[PDB]
Structure formats: structure tokens, C-alpha cells
Amino acid sequence: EDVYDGPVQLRIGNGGAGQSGLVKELADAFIKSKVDSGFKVAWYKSDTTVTINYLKDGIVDVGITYSPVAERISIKHGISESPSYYAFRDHFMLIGPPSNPAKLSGDSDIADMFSKMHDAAEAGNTKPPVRFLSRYDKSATNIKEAELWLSIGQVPWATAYSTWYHQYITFPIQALTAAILLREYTITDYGTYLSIPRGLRDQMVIYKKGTNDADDPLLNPAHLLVGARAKNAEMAKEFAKWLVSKEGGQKVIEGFKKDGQQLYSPAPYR
Ligand SMILES: [Ca+2]
């Protein structure tokens, strides 16, 4: 999808971070420190499932993923080296229209917010009606909201199909833009939010933003996986080590900005 120059000696499979520009900064910083001391870095666009599939078929050397369980299983299969590397922390957010037809209260737990939206959507007698936008595309965001609905015992997509469960299958920015224009609630991410026009942000309200607390459902941890059969093995090991060092990777992440805001939080202290 794009190669950075600071011979290809490092292939990374990822979705959101490359799409946000972080993979560029990271790669240019790594190439920098290896040459600045004693090559190009190619980025392959892929969701977590594919990234792991690539590591398995040796298409990429490393992969930044967003699923601790999938990561653990990839390692159990010998697809990935043990252990995984905590790279950075992204955050999901529940946003909705200023009219707040679901009457969500900022202090409520995210699960109770979902319970409230469901009942209000089922009542269908609000102005505007309560609707929830799902990217319905197997992405980390889709997994997240699907997870949240199930957490309160609901399956909106299953028969006796919940018509207020709105399938708008597109990339992050378009989906958030659509939710705002249509006056619907939706789970989105911090980076996508900072990507839309300021004007649109005034046509929506942030009802819940993920924190860095380890058990916050809206926390979106990113880990790096080193392929077991990976080509350029020693460099994948080099990148992995560099990425988590306060000196390299963590410094670049702590300073990576978008719309004048730090996009991601550094990995937890270790
Ligand atoms: Ca996503």
C-alpha cells in the first residue's frame, strides 16, 4: 500500500495506524536509527485477521494488531513469536446527535448507554428516532460495537432484525460523517474524529471516550507480532525491540499528532 525510505528489509501488516500516518513516522524513525547507526519499510494494509494470515504465509514480517485473543492464538499456532509487544493505546468513542433522543447521561457506564439506546430505539417514538450506525465490515470498530450489544444480551443483526441497526459499509471517516449527517449514534475512534471537519464535530456529541484503564471496554490496544517464519527475521526482532523502547518507538508515538492533538497513548509502563 506504501513503502517508506526514511532494498526492502521490513514488511508490516496493519490497518488503522498506517491509515493514520503513524506507520510512516515509525518506519522513517526506525530506518533512521539503524542507518544513523550501523533500507526501506513496506506497509501492507490489512485488518487483524489478514495481518495474521500474512504472517502465516510470510507475506509480512510483523503486524500491528488489535485483538489480544487473536494474538494469543496466533502464537499458540506457532504463526507468531512469543511474546507479543504492546505498541500503543488507541481509543474508541460513542458519539451521537445533540438532540440525544436516547437521553444518554455522560456518567453512565457504556453498557448502560447501550441498554438505553436499545430500549429507546425499540420504543421508536423519539425525535429523531434512535438509530445506531454499524460499519458491518468485520473491522475492529465493528467487532467493538458488536461486542457491546452482546454484552447487554442483544443481537440487533439477528432475525427479528432490528431496523434501527443501520448498516453503512464504508471506511471510518465516511461512516462517522454519515452518522453525524443522519443524526445517529455510532462507535468510532479518536483518530477518525480528529479527521472530520470541525463544523461536523459541532453537529455531534461525545457521550463516552475510552480511557487508558486496562479494563475500559473502549480501550483499543495495539500489539506487534513477530512472524515465526518471517523473512528478515533479525530486523523484525530489531523493530520489535525498538518499538517498545522509551527511546525509539514510544518517543515517536508520544509525539505523533493529528489536528494538533496526540493521537495515541504510549504503551503502558513496563
Ligand atoms: Ca476499525
Provide the residue ranges of all domains of the chain, joining segments of one domain with +.
1-92+218-270, 94-217
CA of 34 to the centre of ligand 1 (A): 31
First to last CA, the chain: 32
Q: From residue 1, how far is each of 11, 43, 44, 50, 226 by CA, in Å?
A: 11, 6, 5, 14, 20
Domains 1-92+218-270 and 94-217 share a fold: yes
Method used experimentally = X-ray
CA of 58 to the centre of ligand 1 (A): 24
| Alpha-carbon gap, residue 108 to 94, rounded angstroms | 12
CA of 171 to the centre of ligand 1 (A): 8
CA of 50 to the centre of ligand 1 (A): 13
Q: What is the CATH number of domain 94-217?
A: 3.40.190.10
Question: Within its chain, how far is the Cα of 269 from the centroid?
Answer: 20
CA angle 265, 269, 270 (to 5 degrees): 135
| Alpha-carbon gap, residue 13 to 239, rounded angstroms | 13
| Alpha-carbon gap, residue 123 to 144, rounded angstroms | 24
Looking at domain 1-92+218-270, its CATH class is: alpha beta
Nearest to 122 by CA among 94, 93, 92, 149: 149
The x, y and z cell numbers of residue 228, run together, are 515465526
CA of 9 to the centre of ligand 1 (A): 27
Q: From residue 109, how far is each of 1, 113, 215, 217 by CA, in Å?
A: 39, 6, 12, 10
The x, y and z cell numbers of residue 242, run together, are 525498538
Q: Which helix (H) or strand (E) holds 185?
A: strand 185-189
Q: Which residue reads 523493530 in cell numbers?
A: 239
Q: Which residue reads 501492507 in cell numbers?
A: 44
The phi, psi pair for 14, rounded to 5°, reads -165, 170
Contact 13, 63 (CB under 8 A): yes
CA of 192 to the centre of ligand 1 (A): 9
| Alpha-carbon gap, residue 67 to 77, rounded angstroms | 15
DSSP 248: T
- Enumerate residues with CB within 5 Å of ligand 1 (an ion): 139-141
Find residue 42's DSSP bridge partners.
3, 11
CA of 37 to the centre of ligand 1 (A): 36
Burial of 65 (0-12, 13-18, 19+ CB in 10 A): buried
DSSP 206: E
Chain breaks in the chain (C to N over 2.5 A) after: 6, 38
The x, y and z cell numbers of residue 167, run together, are 448498516
**DSSP labels for 11-66?**
EEEESHHHHHTHHHHHHHHHHHHHHS---EEEEEE--HHHHHHHHHTTS-SEEEES
The phi, psi pair for 68, rounded to 5°, reads -50, -40
CA of 151 to the centre of ligand 1 (A): 19
Nearest to 63 by CA among 82, 85, 78: 85
Contact 169, 45 (CB under 8 A): no
Exposure b/e, 193-210, CB count within 10 A at least 16 = b: bbbbeeeebeebbebbeb
CA of 190 to the centre of ligand 1 (A): 11
